[model samples]
Structures are given as C-alpha cells and as structure tokens.
Target chain A: VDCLPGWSAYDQSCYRVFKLLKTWDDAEKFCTERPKGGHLVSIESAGERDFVAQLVSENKQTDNVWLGLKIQSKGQQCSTEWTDGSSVSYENFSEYQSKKCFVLEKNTGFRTWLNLNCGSEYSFVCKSPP
Target chain B: GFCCPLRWSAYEGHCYLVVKEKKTWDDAEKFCTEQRKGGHLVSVHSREEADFLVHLAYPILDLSLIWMGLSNMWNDCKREWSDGTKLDFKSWAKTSDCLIGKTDGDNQWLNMDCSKKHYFVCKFKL
Candidate 1:
C-alpha cells in the first residue's frame, strides 16, 4: 500500500512515529483524529515490532513510546487489548501485568514493552490501514 | 577553526545568510553563487537545519516568503537542490516547482512558480 509523504509503509500499513509528548489517551485521540483516520500502533508480529523499533531509533526518540496496548479486566482476570480492536496475536512485554497502558521503552537497549500509567506522557507511534 | 564571512551566522560547520532582496529563483541562486566565498541557495538535509533556517529568516522577513534550493524543474518525480546536495529531508506543504518557506505561519515548504520574486537564504561550507 502507498503511504503518505511522512509515513513509512510496511505490510500493507502506513506508520508514522512522532516525538511529541502526550499521554496515552491523548496520543490515541491524536492518532484517531489524523487526516487518514489512524490509531495508536498495534504491533501484531515480531517483524512489525522490530520495524517500529527501527522507526523510533531513526527518529532518535529515546523516551518511552505509547503503544495501543491497554490492560483490560474481566472480573478477576486481566488481559491486554489493542486500542484498534485487533486480536492480540503477538506481544513483547517486558513486564506481564500492570493494569495500565503499555509503552515501548526505546531508551532501554532491549526495546521491550513496559506497562505505565495511562496518564504518563510519552512520544507515540500511529498507523493507518492499507 | 573555520569562520564564516561577516554578517553570516555559523552553525554546524556551515554559514547561513538571508538575502532580503527579492528575486526570482534563478536570480536568487545567481546571487548566492556570486558571493565572495562561493555559496548556493540553502539546502536543508535535516529538521534541525530546516528549523534553524526558518528561525533565521522569520524575524528578518516577517510574513514574507523565502526561496529554498529545492525544485523539480529538471524532473517532475526527482526534486533536487540548487547546490546539488542530496534531498534527504522534506517538509512540503503541497506544490508548482520551486519551493518557498512560509515565514508568517508554519515553516513547512510550499512550491511556487520559479519566476516569482522572493527573498532567499544562502548557505556556505565553513
């Protein structure tokens, strides 16, 4: 799929990593309000996860990056779900559970996902469908 | 240590100067070339460079537009810099052929007719 001027294309989707700091909720709102109607990135595979990591590295944003993953509780059990409503097929979480929003720790060498308070501010990545 | 000519600001090993004189894109490029130390119309390769150029020109030419070195006159698909530098960074605001920077609003680039007259910035290697 063809991507816009500032977005990178991969696997029939367009991704753009932003360095602007925003809370997880605000980041998701911003992505949803995009001209092309996007959502906070929902990494569905290891390849997509690596691609996003490379984008963060290219932008030199070492701060935490908000992902679309959010902790959902069903009575006593809790699970992570993507904001885009995609099935949770793949995950790279450094911490399993925190009952909060998740972020990509680009500052850490491992570049793994970590749970953080939904109100915590961080840079974010957004994606548009094919 | 290298030094830029008088009135030119130095940053990251390059010297920048904003020529307030309004001229066509070709004339602006010619003016930059005829400088005492050879130079070319400013070619931006990074966001930092673009921001610096915008801030450098905005205060001096409030609300007026400035010409950049980018143009697609040679090839529609392949835009190039007047200085022949690689076009690595782009902040286009949607186009005609020659690029201009908005000093009044957001610093994104907008293409204009090459024959239009506008103030321009020049860059020289230190």
Candidate 2:
C-alpha cells in the first residue's frame, strides 16, 4: 500500500500532521468529531517531511495548512506531547500572544511556522504509506 | 525530549543530541534494552540537548517528528507523560490515546493517527 500526502510513514504507520496546532477542549472534540479528527499529525521523520515538501510544491500551495499541531502549555499538557518543548517554552517570546496556544503554519513554501492560540477549520493531511 | 529540542536524535552514549521514540513506559524500556546500549532516551534536561542534532540533521537530510526511544506515556487519568516523570510536556491540538489506550477510535492515539505508524528516533551508546 502507499501512504497519503502530508503524511510520513514509519514501519506500519504514517503521521498525518505536523507543525502542531492549538485548540480548546471543545474545539478539539469538534475537530475529532469531524471526518477523522479534522486534522493531521506531524511528519514521522525526515523522509516524510521531504515527501510532504515535494507534494506541497507539486500542489502549488502557498499558505500554511491546518496541521494537527496544537498546544495549551507544557505544564498544562493539553492534548498530545510534542517530544520537544518547542511549543511549551513559548515563554516571553519576542512577539508573544496571550492565547498561549500553538498551530502550524505551512503558509510558506520553504518552511512551515508555528503560531499561538488560533483555531481554524481546514483540511489536514496525514501520512500515507504501506 | 518532547519538551526540549524540536527533536533530539539519540545514539549509543553521551549524545549531546538525542531523540527517542515516544513509546509506552513498558514498550519504550523494552525497545531500549533491545536496541541501543542505553535503556531509554534519558531525560533531556536542556533544549541544547536536542538543538545539536537540529544543527546536525536539519541539513543534508530531513526527518519527521521521530519517535524518540520514548514511547507510550503513563496516563495520569488526565494527561499522559512520556515517562512516569512529569518533567517535560507538549500537547497536540487534540490528542491521540489515553487511559483507554488506542483500543477503539475513541482512545486511538490522538496527536497522530495510529494507522500511520511513523518512524521513531532510536538510541544507542557511544
């Protein structure tokens, strides 16, 4: 079998989202209620990132996609745990936002960005592989 | 190091940069014993721990949110910690599995879909 775009495979699984997003408790539930969580997970590995990069390029996308990335706070530990506290250590950021939330920004072709407290309804891409 | 480096790629031993899979406590330990000379990816005290690899790996190759030797967490009724320790924490917008485990879609791993088993960052000794 083959994995889907926006997703990276690893062994028997593939990740659908990355660049994590931020949502409230109810918002997240709403997302899951949507067709298959309504979001994607982070890329599983470098391979998947590369694949996604290529796919995005091929698709001619410009803005960031609604990825599965999200956050409340490290100590808060809202939804999932991003091995790296990149989202957690969002303290005293040069350009800080009160939302304290995190979301992915695939807006740029070169790299996706992570932002704070912004929920959006968008299609997500999960890992697609055999 | 979910709460540390954007990621850490662990190796045999004394790795300034290490990224292990997020396996369950039991499974992660088993993976460590089975693979790397180390038991499991030790606690990543500082961000620098994982930054090294970012500098090293970000270039020349691409990697996913690798499953650092870390595995499933010990669900504390509400939140699940990578290990029994409450040191580091990072939450996905939603969440994958929890107290129920990824048994049914209800408890199925939250952050990422389970069907898409992704690659994991393993560890070893130097």
Candidate 3:
C-alpha cells in the first residue's frame, strides 16, 4: 500500500507530522489510534532521520518536536524504547539532559535530540508501514 | 558573517575543502588532520551535505570518484567515520572497507581498497 493522503513516503514506510501540540503520551496514543495502525516514528538510519527532520522542520511551530523515543527509568540507569516497538538501533542525542522523553531540536540542523519531561507539549510525527 | 578559508567552502555550520591531490584513505585523513584548523576527511550525514560535496568539486575535479570518511578497517563487520562521529547516515552503493562517493547518481557511495589513491574532501566546524 502507498502512503495515505497528506503523508510522506520514504523508503518502505510512510510518515506524517502533526502540527497539533500534545504531550508525549497523548501523541503516541493519537498515532496508535490512527486508521492505518501507526505509531510515533522510529528513525532507524541517517536517511530516515534526515527525512523525518525535514518533515518536522516544515510542520513544527515550536523549537522542539516529539519523537518516538522514550527513556525508561530502571534503577539508577536508563534505557530507551521506541513507541513503534522497533529496536533502538540509532540515536542522535545532543546531550543527556536527564529527562524521560525525546524531542528533536529544530535549530540544530535536525541532527540532534534532547531529552525532556514526557508531559511537555509539542508537535509530533508518526510513521506506518506502506 | 561566518566564512571559511580561501580554499574552503562553507555550508551549514561547517567548512569543506576538496583536496585534488590523490592520496590513500589513511593519508587523506592525515592530511586533513594536519590542516590549520584540524579537520578530518568529510563525514556526510545528509543528502544536502553529500550533494554539496559533489557540487563543490564538480568545477575543479572529475566527479567519477572521491574518498569520504567511512571505513570498516577497525571491524570488518561494521563501518565508522574517521572523525569519530556516530555512523548515523549512509549512502553505500556497496562496500569492501574504505568508502568513496560517486557523484554519477545521487552521490551514492561505494567501498573500495583503502590503499587506493584518490582525491578527498575535508571538513571542519567554521
């Protein structure tokens, strides 16, 4: 299947950026409930990241936008998982800010991410298989 | 206004220079590191960056091939950039160890013998 109307197609997946602001959890819920069975985007390669970054840059109304990555607090250490249930193979964290949610910073050429509280509201992007 | 050196070209927040002198992958990296501002063989992270490198050299040198910063010399199973940055992006057409950029089609990459001599690009923060 091809990408739905208003969604951008790249590689084998389809993506869409939602300009509507929402918290990390709310955004994931929105994506999961979509008609095409999508989830927050899981950027696995540099090409995908660049593609998504361009999408986010175009749709973002704020300085930061939520990605699918969520940091889990396990004892004193932390681990990351994507909302899409994909393996966390690639990461571009600009710095470890000791936060629980991941957001892409638009000003850094879309090459870096910043961790922030999950409750922070921002625009988000979603991805689905095509 | 931010600018690069006389021979270097500026893009985004980095400066790039295409060395027409042919050198092996290792020697090319060393030459970049020895430059005044201390750079490394260019590590491309985006299509725009790759395109910029190709266009920057199109006027002066043949675009058939040029050395980039990717190599699997450290581990045959994995590739990494010589600049020590994370391998976030890749444009490999195929691999054998040392990476080279072919501008013939969308700047796709190809891996070749590290000891082979070729022109290379260098990059550093402006």
Candidate 4:
C-alpha cells in the first residue's frame, strides 16, 4: 500500500497538505495527532524540496509554508535539526535567518528559504512514515 | 449535539460566521474549507436565508461588498453555488453586475472581481 487517499506517495514516504492555518507548533501538533503525523516535512534533497513546493502550489496559493527545521541554541552554539530525529545534514536556508523555525518561500524561481517566527500561523505539509 | 465556533450563529443545520477579515474569493473559500471543518463560503437557498445574512452583517459592516459561495464557474452566464448546486433563489441588483454574490446600493447581489478582498461569511455544518 502506498498511502491513504488524498496523500501523495514518493520515495517511500507519504505526504499530505494541511491547508489549515496554524502556528508552527500547532501545525506540528496537528500532524503528530493524525495517522502518520510524523513531523512537518524535513527536506533532505533538492528534488524533495521541489516536490513539496510543487505540491503546495498544486493545492493552494503561494504563501509561506512551514518546514520542520528549527535552530537549536545551547548558550551560544546553535544547530538545525529535524523533529523526526533524522540527521540535519541537508539545509535550505537563506543568509538572514530566524531562530525558531524555517519557511519555504512560494517563489518557484528562487526557492528562497527563511527563518520565521514560530508563532506565525501558516499552512504546512506533513509526512507519514513509509 | 452540533457545535459551532463561538460567536458563529447556528441556524437549522449550519453554522455561519460573517468574517471581518478580507480575502480574495478563492482564498475565502479555501480559508473556510481549511479552518472550519467542511466549511465553505455561505450559500443562500431562499429569500429568508438571504435576508438573515443581510440582517446579521449590515449593521456592523462598514463595506457593502462581501463574498459569497455563488460563482459562475462554467462561464455559461448561470451562477451556481460553490457546493455545485443550482441556485434556488436569485437576488441580483438591477444596476450592479459582477456574477459572484456581492451586494450593492441597497444590499442586492452584484457581480464583482474575484481578485478583490472583502469580508466573507463561512458556513459549516453543525
């Protein structure tokens, strides 16, 4: 079985668009409570990023979308990580960054990523375990 | 028991909210669809229902324009509800023309640009 109805299956992962506007943590909780609500998508490759971006466009307008990467701060040191406990080897952030969370711009040509306030509400995508 | 978001009026089997925020017609629909479970821009089936909407929105509303679920999608000059049903009642203003349900002059339906943002009412099943 690939995935439930309304979900797109690719690369052994199932993705669904959550169009409801909610804060970053609220969106995360939304996915976490549902079946296969693993985490906000943790993008690992360029292809995956494109795929997600396209998916959002196909569903709705070009607003900022929430991503699963959050910068961790231990005193002065900081690092990014995925909520699924996956390694944060891949990144897609712009030069200026926010401390709480990341968002992928709707601009298709540039694909600019930005650090955004965690409390800002926006639609997000959720990934289910394969 | 059926429930609606606080402040949303529940009538019959539906809950309605005259949202004050502005959004394009499509965005308004999407907002209701996403935020309100199975919600959509409000749809009117009768003069009674339409009048109720006017009564609820008129006094507090500063703008005469509002978004409705009615649209002329097929471009056949026939307006249809967003839920894909034929309109049982018509409430068009004689002087106004847009096609989607916008009220003007005296709160009669007028066609307006879909791109423009306006306060909208969302209807959810209760």
* Interface RMSD for candidates 1 onward, in order: 24.0, 15.1, 17.9, 27.2
Best by lDDT: 1
Q: Each predicted complex: what DockQ?
A: 0.01, 0.02, 0.02, 0.01
Query: Candidate 1 DockQ score?
Result: 0.01
Off by over 4 Å in 4: A75-98, B1-126
Residue-by-residue lDDT tens digits, candidate 3, A12-130? 78899888889888998898887877787766688887888788777644567777765443321122321212222322222222245667776674556655667788888888766
Per-model lDDT = 0.67, 0.37, 0.67, 0.61
- Candidate 1's clash total is 0
Best by TM-score: 3
Query: Which CAPRI level is candidate 1?
Result: incorrect
Tens-digit per-residue lDDT, B43-93, candidate 3: 766667667877887776865677877665212223322113354543322
Give the better candidate number (3 or 4) by TM-score: 3
TM-scores for the candidates: 0.41, 0.30, 0.42, 0.41
Q: Least lDDT summed over 10 consecutive residues: which range in candidate 3 chain A?
A: A75-84
The residue-by-residue lDDT of candidate 1 on B14-87, one tens digit each, is 89999999999889988988884658787665557667877888889877788877654212233232222354
lDDT of 1 by residue, A1-130 (tens): 7888889999998999887899887998898887888788776666877788888888888677887766543321122221212222322112221225667775553157655567787889988864
Instruction: Give the lDDT of residue B54 in candidate 4.
Output: 76
| CA lDDT for candidate 2 | 0.37
Model 1 chain B weakest 10-residue run by lDDT:
B74-83
